[PDB]
Write a protein that binds this DNA or RNA. Structure first.
Ligand SMILES: [Mg+2]
Ligand SMILES: [Mg+2]
Lengths: 239, 239
DNA sequence: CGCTACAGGTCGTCC
DNA sequence: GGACGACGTGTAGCG
């Protein structure tokens, strides 16, 4: 239990069970290379036929099944799921989440490798360049929008929806910003339009919307213009 | 090397280099257990300090870095990225994505395990209970919407945006359907309202919007009612 | 929990 | 290759 790694290739069932169950009691990452079938029923339902895949069970219950292509797991289970290992015609990894009820079944036809990784990590990700940091830059230097802009509220719930920044201009109008940390799309403009309309019905037609993004799509421009909304070019800042 | 799996615990640098090399040449899966540092720069910028993680490099270029928590990799690179291994003071995995330019740098301070898995998988996931299945059901069976509903188009570009289902009703009105495979939120109603207004521009007051979904959030229902749009309860079929 | 919206979203289709 | 929207989206904030 004091080795970081414990690896077995071509494990016997006995060896499988021993390492699987120690991974769980030790709350260590479990990794397995195997030929398997996968059955999922839950929010949706899926079958994956027999094939080789990497399987990972994290100590927090996160379950991953990866094919040899793409970024997404072909199947998974979220944190807080519970897995048991089941002996049947083959060993079967069964993971269940409660609410909503989702079942993942991994039938292990052939286990090429099983491993316990007792991983120590006290460190957490520090990311910069987010939308939240655009909001900060704007409250710290409102001029990046325009002279006299005064930011007032961040994530202000209006009647229906939550607007990213609510504010006032030099004419004393209410100003909605919608921020995107990347090229803004039709859905961004729909957010803004939706918020502005809701405000307009309280505060009159003078309410301004501004989409604040590094750029926007052909579609966003068209709809923005058609709706009389505005665009300010802003890049997400990186610390 | 002719084996499906090769595993070396506590590799030397030469051992490390060798397996990494083979994984890439053999189009195999590369899995590393390591204490590392991660530096990422690209669409955003991030730093992860020294800690233990699982690393996976797929033969299609997908790069994954997993902490012992959550379902998401703490850092990654998408399919198509090119990876190399540089020997600085420590070995450094470098994976770069062209377009947009993104670089991922993993300093391997200690490699606990490195493995090559030559995975054979000819099988594609088969999933049921999607939104597209809802659409099929509605074309096969339009009365699930209402009697004498005539479905005409599916994923139809209108001028700005794309409608899930476009049709007519028995009274000669045009019908927009917005479909959701799960409980519908504000986002959905905004989509629906947006399309219906665009269609009203051409066909005038004779357009109906219908949100089709297993249920609604409070905000959705509120907004839906406000704009006088309609709801039909439908569960995605599991076939 | 339920609502709401962001994400380095990823992914697939189709103009 | 851009635009557009679904996704078993996952994840975080907030009430
Ligand atoms: Mg917003
Ligand atoms: Mg839609």
């Amino acid at each position: 239990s004091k080795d970081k790694v414990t690896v077995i290739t071509s494990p016997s069932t006995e060896e499988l069970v021993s390492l699987v169950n120690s991974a769980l009691l030790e709350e260590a990452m479990l990794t397995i290379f195997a030929r398997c079938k996968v059955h999922y029923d839950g929010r949706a339902k899926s079958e994956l036929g027999s094939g080789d895949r990497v399987i990972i069970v994290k100590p927090d219950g996160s379950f991953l099944i990866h094919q040899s292509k793409k970024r997404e797991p072909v199947n998974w289970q979220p944190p807080g799921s519970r897995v048991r290992l089941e002996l049947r015609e083959n060993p079967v990894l069964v993971s269940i989440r409660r609410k909503p009820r989702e079942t993942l079944e991994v039938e292990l036809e052939e286990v090429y490798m099983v491993s316990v990784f007792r991983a120590e990590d006290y460190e957490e990700l520090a990311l910069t360049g987010s939308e939240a940091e655009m909001a900060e830059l704007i409250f710290e230097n409102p001029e990046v929008i325009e002279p006299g802009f005064k930011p007032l509220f961040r994530e202000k719930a209006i009647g229906t929806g939550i607007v990213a920044v609510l504010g006032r201009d030099s004419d004393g109008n209410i100003v909605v910003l919608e921020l995107k940390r990347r090229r803004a799309e039709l859905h961004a403009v729909r957010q803004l339009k939706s918020y502005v309309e809701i405000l307009r019905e309280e505060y009159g037609d003078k309410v301004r919307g501004i989409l604040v993004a590094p750029s926007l799509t052909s579609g966003a421009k068209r709809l923005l213009e058609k709706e009389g909304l505005e665009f300010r070019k802003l890049e997400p800042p990186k610390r």
